């Protein structure tokens, strides 16, 4: 009974302190920064061969190889430069909502409605891709996957809980709790010591991977957060919501810096990504388009008109030389 | 592709493309049906030819030169809105209801209304099954169908009671171009695959009418 009052007043103290820091809005400091101009980007590649809708995609750290997951039960590894199909992996279950590419490139991960994260070893002595391990323990579907090393991976489920695994042993090293709704995405910090997760409770929180503790929690979205990504320097991140807006949060300031809404936008964002510098913010919507945002001034700097269906995934190469987008029309398109 | 090793890589890519195409062909005669309903609704015992195969359960019985896949999403215990779009392309939705569980009738109706009007299922037809007639006939005599539906005004006979139940379920459509194929089945009813097949036949024909430009 009394704790409820204590809970309410603690929230007020956070907000009151949060209000003290705000002196000038992000848009009010960077008003005299010259714009970026119309960002005209044209398709360069069109990877076709996926039959059903594409739900996930990840870039190799070498900025040349790709991995994409489709509802047809196939996981294809593409050579971006030539459009060659390096690998094609059959999946046990055709309901896949995520996929990840290991930093070393030796392994690849997959998961979905089956509640299992499957890990496939690509560099085998037998010349074929085999499932090295299957990770179980989540009681709901799997939303995201991100490798930390060759022997450590982070997952998020609709169970309202994230986890950290030890692929060698196969058990669950640490479990992160605190969300009150489905967890829909996460992005690993560049130094791989913290990460953030966007949930359906209209909130995102910052987690210490080593300590298994929630360091911070960020609010402001009116609906579920569909996607999330770290700023390149690791001191901010951006979230995409069904609210039809994206927002930029700062860890040190611990607030929301800017919003990326336009009156002509009505649908929700499905993916979010940054450029190598961090000035462009690319997000994919349900209107079959991706908008490039001048993250420093919140202006539509361009549109990637393409695809005949919803855009489900986004990606930018570690070198920043290309952008890849997948859609429900079963096509990946590379832009430059 | 000039280089000798780049020529062999191009060959490997084509061998993959060929296998992808063949797999698509072999998985083209399959009709995907989504199973829904509350617990103890008979959703696990519709067609006695199961051949099954926590998470998502699939069943892949075959009948009359056609491959039917029945997907059961029970046990997810999550918010449907975030995984329902995965089934946007199913041919039809099979819905099961238990006529002998009055206290669960309201939950079934709430489920039906939400699914029938989902933005993703604006075009997918529904096959409503009203299971366990025999218990319904035995239970109605002892307990009138007034406690579950206080607004019921018709007689207390089996024929009239069932029609009212079906009417309420059909009353949630609130849209054209989507039809509901309601049927009544018992525990000892072997001909359940036949009902799904012919209903799917009408669903397929209706879709072709749209594709062929006749609608």
């Amino acid at each position: 009974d009394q704790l409820r009052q204590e809970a309410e007043q603690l929230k007020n103290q956070i907000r009151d302190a949060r209000k003290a820091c705000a002196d000038a809005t992000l848009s009010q400091i960077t008003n005299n920064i010259d714009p970026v101009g119309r960002i005209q980007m044209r398709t360069r590649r069109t990877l076709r061969g996926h039959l059903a809708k594409i739900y996930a995609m990840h870039w190799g750290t070498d900025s040349r190889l790709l991995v994409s997951a489709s509802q047809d039960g196939k996981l294809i590894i593409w050579d971006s430069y030539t459009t060659n199909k390096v690998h094609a992996i059959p999946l046990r279950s055709s309901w896949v909502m995520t996929c990840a590419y290991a930093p070393s490139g030796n392994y690849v991960a997959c998961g979905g409605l089956d509640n299992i994260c499957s890990i496939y070893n690509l560099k085998t002595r037998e010349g074929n891709v085999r499932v090295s391990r299957e990770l179980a323990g989540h009681t709901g579907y799997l939303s995201c996957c991100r490798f930390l090393d060759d022997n450590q991976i982070v997952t998020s489920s609709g169970d309202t809980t994230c986890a950290l695994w030890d692929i060698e042993t196969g058990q669950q090293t640490t479990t992160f709790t605190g969300h009150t709704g489905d967890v829909m995405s996460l992005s690993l910090a560049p130094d791989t010591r913290l990460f953030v997760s966007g949930a359906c409770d209209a909130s995102a929180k910052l987690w210490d991977v080593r300590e298994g503790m929630c360091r911070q929690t960020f609010t402001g979205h009116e609906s579920d957060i569909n996607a999330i990504c770290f700023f390149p320097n690791g001191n901010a991140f951006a979230t995409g919501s069904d609210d039809a807006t994206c927002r930029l949060f700062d860890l040190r300031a611990d607030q929301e810096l800017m919003t990326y809404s336009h009156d002509n936008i009505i649908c929700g964002i499905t993916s979010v990504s940054f450029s190598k510098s961090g000035r462009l913010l690319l997000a994919g919507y349900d209107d079959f388009n991706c908008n490039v945002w001048d993250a420093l001034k919140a202006d539509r700097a361009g549109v990637l008109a393409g695809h005949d269906n919803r855009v489900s995934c986004l990606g930018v190469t570690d070198d920043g030389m290309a952008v890849a987008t997948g859609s429900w029309d079963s096509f990946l398109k590379i832009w430059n | 592709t000039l280089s000798a090793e780049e020529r062999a890589a191009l060959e490997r890519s084509k061998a993959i493309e060929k296998n992808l195409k063949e797999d698509g062909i072999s998985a083209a005669k399959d009709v995907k049906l989504l199973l829904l309903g509350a617990d103890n609704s008979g959703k696990s015992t519709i067609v006695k030819q199961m051949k099954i195969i926590t998470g998502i359960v699939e069943t892949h019985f075959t009948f009359k030169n056609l491959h039917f896949r029945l997907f059961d999403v029970g046990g997810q215990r999550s918010e449907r809105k975030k995984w329902i779009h995965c089934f946007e392309d199913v041919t039809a939705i099979i819905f099961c209801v238990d006529l002998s569980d009055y206290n669960r009738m309201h939950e079934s109706l709430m489920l039906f209304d939400s699914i029938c009007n989902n933005k993703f299922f604006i075009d997918t037809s529904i096959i409503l099954f009203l299971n366990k007639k025999d218990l319904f006939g035995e239970k109605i005599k002892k307990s009138p169908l007034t406690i579950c539906f206080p607004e019921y005004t018709g007689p207390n006979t089996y024929e009239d009671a069932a029609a009212y139940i079906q009417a309420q379920f059909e009353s949630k459509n609130r849209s054209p171009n989507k039809e509901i194929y309601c049927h009544m089945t018992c525990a000892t009813d072997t001909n359940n695959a036949q009902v799904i097949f012919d209903a799917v036949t009408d669903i397929i024909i209706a879709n072709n009418l749209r594709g062929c430009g006749l609608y």
Partner: single-chain antibody
Amino acid sequence: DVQLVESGGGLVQPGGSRKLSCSASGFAFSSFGMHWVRQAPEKGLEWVAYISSGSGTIYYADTVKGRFTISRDDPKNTLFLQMTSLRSEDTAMYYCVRSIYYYGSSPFDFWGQGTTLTVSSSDIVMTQATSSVPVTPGESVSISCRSSKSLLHSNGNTYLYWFLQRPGQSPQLLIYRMSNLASGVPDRFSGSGSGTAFTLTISRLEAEDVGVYYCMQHLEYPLTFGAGTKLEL
């Protein structure tokens, strides 16, 4: 484990015919291109024939074109070589090799054990200047082999392979394009070069590094080897 075992060699009369069989066991044989390489008594490796995955592409050396034919039996996991009219120049130990081609692969990693065949009685040229190189353990060594054309390509990949053959054993892959360490070899080996001059350098030489080192070009068929450089202890 991976295993290629060959059989069918022996003594044949000139003008006769024989068939060599190479049975694979322990990998996805259907996905690997397969080569035949022969080494006449104390002469040096020489490429013979190549059959791709799915049997789409077949190549032969000019020496054996018309006489030899290479066939693959995927369901039975066997590789064949049919030799029709054998001269006295075909006597050699024939090796069965495996090659898989995709972006970033190692296409000559595993070699067969070899079968001996005895018969009674334009191209890129790669040269290894030195034939022998005395050395003691713990001393750095360097081996170099030139070429006619520049093995560098528009891709930026230099197509040069380094193989080490130990006394009485089949060759082993060390460096597959110009500097990439083949899986399983110690990190002491290194490779470098530019265009037409290459060098393989060994640091902290061990007692197991004694053998013959061959350099091969995979830029375009027919594949050609070097003369070979021998290390003496």
